[PDB]
């Protein structure tokens, strides 16, 4: 298992514009296109992202291309974030993937605000962190996903993904 396979599981793959859980126009493997309710806007963002007139439809490769770019951006966001970096660098490989997953989902910003959990994580207080993490809108809005990520963070293994 790895970060790619893990998020491919959490996000799925859709070759046509769709609305995510928040109602936002998305494509491929969780690639957000726009927060705007305009489908045309969304289609405009897609064409821009791909470099062609997609008509709101892309290939599997196209989708995996966007995915890679997105996973890369998520880690670089973490490494550039003053609050995130030190946590990340303190973690083992599996727990680092859990962190990247959250940032992919919620953005740098979103995650940099989990101050309390971030601290417990740095102290290696797995259980407490896990509990603090579940006290969030994130857990209450996508609980099965949140559970998987949290268990990963808590244990350091991929069992939630078997
Ligand atoms: Cl893009
Ligand atoms: Cl979920
Ligand atoms: Xe965290």
Domains of the chain are 1-162 (1.10.530.40)
Resolution (A): 2.0
Q: Are 50 and 42 in contact (CB under 8 A)?
A: no
Q: Are 16 and 56 in contact (CB under 8 A)?
A: yes
What's the gap in Å between 145 CA and the centre of ligand 2? 4
Query: Is 36 assigned a ligand-binding role in the annotation?
Result: no
DSSP helix/strand/coil, 120: helix
DSSP helix/strand/coil, 15: strand
Rounded to whole angstroms, the maximal C-alpha distance in the chain is: 50
Query: Is 32 assigned a ligand-binding role in the annotation?
Result: yes
Return d(Cα 66, Cα 50) in angstroms, integer.
Answer: 8
Return d(Cα 25, Cα 42) in angstroms, integer.
Answer: 6
For ligand 2, a single-atom ion, the residues with CB < 5 A are 142, 144-145
Q: Which residues are catalytic?
A: 11, 20
Return d(Cα 129, Cα 118) in angstroms, integer.
Answer: 8
Extract the runs of DSSP E, i.e. beta strands, from the chain. 14-19, 25-28, 31-34
Q: Which bound ligand lies closest to the C-alpha atom of 119?
A: 3
């Amino acid at each position: 298992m790895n970060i790619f396979e893990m998020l491919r599981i959490d996000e799925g793959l859709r070759l046509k514009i769709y609305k995510d859980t928040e109602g936002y126009y998305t494509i491929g493997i969780g690639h957000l296109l726009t927060k705007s309710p305009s489908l045309n806007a969304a289609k405009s963002e897609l064409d821009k992202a791909i470099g062609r007139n997609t008509n709101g439809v892309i290939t599997k490769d196209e989708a995996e291309k966007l995915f890679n770019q997105d996973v890369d951006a998520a880690v670089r966001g973490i490494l550039r974030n003053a609050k995130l970096k030190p946590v990340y660098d303190s973690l083992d490989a599996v727990r680092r993937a859990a962190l990247i997953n959250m940032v992919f989902q919620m953005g740098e910003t979103g995650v940099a605000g989990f101050t309390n959990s971030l601290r417990m994580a740095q102290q290696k207080r797995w259980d407490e962190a896990a509990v603090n993490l579940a006290k969030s809108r994130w857990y209450n809005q996508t609980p099965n996903r949140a559970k998987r990520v949290i268990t990963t963070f808590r244990t350091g293994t991929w069992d939630a993904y078997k």
